[PDB]
Design a protein around this ligand. Structure first.
Ligand SMILES: Nc1ncnc2c1ncn2[C@@H]1O[C@H](COP(=O)(O)OC(=O)/C=C/C2=CC(=O)C(=O)C=C2)[C@@H](O)[C@H]1O
Ligand SMILES: [Mg+2]
Length: 529
């Protein structure tokens, strides 16, 4: 029998039959006049009323541009009010938003645009070159938020639309609303189908209930420095923030001076961070010149944090509850959330990534035997609940390998739960690399390397790194007679991928360590490092 773990919080009612926009704005009349989005770039503020209205106008505009229920738009933007209006606008139509890093290479963007069947790409003028040819050849509309080059529309064409022209629509709970890309537990990036039901469940798991797991309210100011095109910020910052009526302070990029100035100036109360930001706070000489006493909650997620950094956060944020959250795109994303963040807080331990969310079930499974394990024994973390993905777009085979027929999502993460129901992640079974919290899929890089006429075989694995947590390193077997150097390999990759996917070291070997079956012995390679 499976040994099942649950939250220390009781199950709650979740209205996951509601469309995401209906749920997120359910209580809007209570904070209609309150600030919703604060743009750190220009200090423009939009109220809740504004955000709901603009989203509805954008929905009408998108419909006029040809977006029907179940159609897809691609958002190719930095953190911005426009990102938000496009995302919520598509939700109103029963449509889907796929989101991507605006700094992706042309090849990377086009691959995702093709895979997702995006009908419209929303971007900035400076990135039109990345998609122009593809979009013209395929009649994909390009909408720019700043200035429209030839053959593009301005975002104003969406906001000019009348909110009363939103068509009648019957959105179902299992309808897809968000399509972030993730490589999951093996292979290439795949389209993660996140539904209305799923996202409502995940948000509720965090912020709803008499004692919410992550207590945020309508007087909080939450920093949005994490990218909205990734699921952490999208769900835990934007969607959770909207649900409770919090102010969301948008930053387009991390800059230490801007970051500190904004926290001090706006009296930021919620800090959703990743370990590299925590590291910058611990290391920077200018931090001592700032008043960060306003921050009451500091969360780190997306990558391991560790004891040394956890300590200096305490010092630099004297009034904050500090802890971690643990998410995975396929999981909706949140699996576990620090209970020190609760309205009535629980005691926590350093290095824990939280307690499994309420209205969910967790088990720990030995990868060798398939046996579910008791407390204080490490194995693969698995989760079940309404919050998880519907599956991978156009990939039933990968879905079947990732979520079993009893509804269990296998994360590829190794951990244990202790006597206080605190989850600790100790290792990663899956091949995924995390550079500053960003996914790096080795399979993508390995495919590129194997394509080089002077490379016979290759394996990409994480190497531990202070600044980035992990960096991608390549083990390369040269073809016979090949003289390709470390820099030549690095350059070959650097010309084809976004910066964070770059190979930082190349180790040349006679053979890639493989199992008898020929699967890369990644654990063996990590051990060599
Ligand atoms: N706290 C963590 N400690 C160690 N590893 C972590 C942690 N969080 C994520 N990971 C590793 O990243 C993988 C998922 O990559 P992904 O890029 O799919 O997803 C994320 O990272 C999302 C993390 C979130 C964190 C929050 O606190 C939150 O509120 C909402 C989301 C996952 O399978 C782990 O290997
Ligand atoms: Mg319905």
């Amino acid at each position: 029998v499976d040994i099942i773990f649950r939250s220390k919080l009781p199950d709650i009612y979740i209205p996951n039959h509601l469309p995401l926009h209906s749920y997120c704005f359910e209580n809007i009349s209570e904070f209609s006049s309150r600030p919703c989005l604060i743009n750190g770039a220009n200090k423009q503020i939009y109220t809740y009323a504004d955000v709901e209205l603009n989203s509805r106008k954008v929905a009408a505009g998108l419909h006029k541009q040809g977006i029907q229920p179940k159609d897809t738009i691609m958002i190719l933007l930095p953190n911005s009010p426009e990102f938000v209006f496009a995302f919520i606008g598509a939700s109103y139509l029963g449509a889907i938003s796929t989101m991507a890093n605006p700094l992706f290479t042309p090849a990377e963007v086009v691959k995702q645009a093709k895979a997702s069947s995006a009908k419209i790409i929303v971007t900035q003028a400076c990135h039109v070159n990345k998609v122009k040819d593809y979009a013209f050849e395929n009649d994909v509309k390009i909408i720019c938020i700043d200035s429209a080059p030839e053959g593009c529309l301005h975002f104003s064409v969406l906001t000019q639309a009348n909110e009363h022209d939103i068509p009648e629509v019957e959105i179902q709970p299992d309808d897809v609303v968000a399509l972030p890309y993730s490589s999951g537990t093996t292979g290439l990036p795949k389209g993660v189908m996140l539904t209305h039901k799923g996202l409502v469940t995940s948000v509720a798991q965090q912020v709803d209930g008499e004692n919410p797991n992550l207590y945020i309210h309508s007087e909080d100011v939450m920093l949005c420095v994490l990218p909205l095109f990734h699921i952490y910020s999208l769900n835990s910052v934007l969607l959770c923030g909207l649900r409770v009526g919090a102010a969301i302070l948008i930053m387009q990029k991390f800059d230490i001076v801007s970051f500190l100035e904004l926290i001090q100036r706006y009296k930021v109360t919620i800090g959703p961070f990743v370990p590299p930001i925590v590291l910058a706070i611990a290391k920077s000489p200018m931090v001592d010149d700032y008043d960060l006493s306003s921050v009451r909650t500091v969360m780190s997620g997306a990558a391991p944090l560790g004891k040394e950094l956890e300590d200096t956060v305490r010092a630099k944020f004297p009034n904050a509850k500090l802890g971690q959250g643990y998410g995975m795109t396929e999981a909706g994303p949140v699996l576990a959330m620090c209970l020190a963040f609760a309205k009535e807080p629980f005691e926590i331990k350093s290095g824990a990534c939280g307690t499994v969310v309420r209205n969910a079930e967790m088990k720990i499974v030995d990868p060798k035997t398939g046996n579910s394990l008791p407390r204080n024994q490490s194995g693969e973390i698995c989760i079940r609940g309404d919050q998880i993905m519907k599956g991978y777009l156009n990939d039933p085979e990968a879905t079947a390998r990732t979520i079993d027929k009893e509804g269990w999502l296998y994360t590829g993460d190794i951990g244990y739960i202790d006597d206080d129901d605190e989850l600790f992640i100790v290792d990663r079974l899956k091949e995924l690399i995390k550079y500053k919290g960003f996914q790096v899929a080795p399979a993508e890089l390995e495919a590129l390397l194997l394509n080089h006429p002077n490379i016979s075989d290759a394996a990409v694995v994480p190497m531990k790194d202070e600044q980035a947590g992990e960096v991608p390193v390549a083990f390369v077997v040269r073809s016979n007679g090949s003289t390709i150097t470390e820099d030549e390999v690095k350059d070959f990759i650097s010309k084809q991928v976004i910066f964070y996917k770059r190979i930082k070291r190349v180790f040349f070997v006679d053979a890639i360590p493989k199992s008898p079956s020929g699967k890369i012995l990644r654990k063996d390679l990590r051990a060599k490092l």
